[PDB]
Amino acid sequence: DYIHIRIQQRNGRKTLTTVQGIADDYDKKKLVKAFKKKFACNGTVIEHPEYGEVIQLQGDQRKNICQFLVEIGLAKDDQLKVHGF
RNA sequence: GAAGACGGUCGAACUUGACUAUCUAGAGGAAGUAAAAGUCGUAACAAGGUUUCCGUAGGUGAACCUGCGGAAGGAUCAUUA
Numbered sequence: 001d002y003i004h005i006r007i008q009q010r011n012g013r014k015t016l017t018t019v020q021g022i023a024d025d026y027d028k029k030k031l032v033k034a035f036k037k038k039f040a041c042n043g044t045v046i047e048h049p050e051y052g053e054v055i056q057l058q059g060d061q062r063k064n065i066c067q068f069l070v071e072i073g074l075a076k077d078d079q080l081k082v083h084g085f
Numbered sequence: 086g087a088a089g090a091c092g093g094u095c096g097a098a099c100u101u102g103a104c105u106a107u108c109u110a111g112a113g114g115a116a117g118u119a120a121a122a123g124u125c126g127u128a129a130c131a132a133g134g135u136u137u138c139c140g141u142a143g144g145u146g147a148a149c150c151u152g153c154g155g156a157a158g159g160a161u162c163a164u165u166a
Contacts, residue, residue: 013125
């Protein structure tokens with residue numbers, strides 16, 4: 001159950017980095033209000049349906065996630081699966 | 086009538102703290118600046134599609150949003166009952 005991401009870029013620039021694999025019993029207020037106030041990018045929480053509750057931060061956390069995922073203590077340093085859109 | 090010498094005064098200098106002024110090293114940290122052809126959003130000159138802005142308080146990725154009292158430098162110098 002690797003927390004899939006996917007990115008999805010509209011315009012030459014109109015991107016949305018999803019988060020697939022994140023439980024719902026986690027802090028849907030602290031998850032993201034810890035994100036936005038961090039690398040400084042518009043997070044939020046939708047019920048995307050090909051995935052099932054994903055967190056839209058507004059940005060390209062493609063290089064940062066690699067990292068906010070060699071740290072922490074929840075995910076894994078191997079379950080890394082980036083398909084930026 | 087010399088060296089010396091009693092005690093004093095001036096007091097250089099030296100030793101230790103305090104005081105004041107001026108200058109100057111510094112791991113790192115956080116601003117602002119340049120600036121600028123980068124990344125993510127669209128915050129606010131045409132009513133900029135939420136009129137704008139002031140004082141002030143709280144809050145937000147970020148422009149910013151919002152209440153309360155102002156102003157028009159506004160989009161009304163008029164309202165004809």
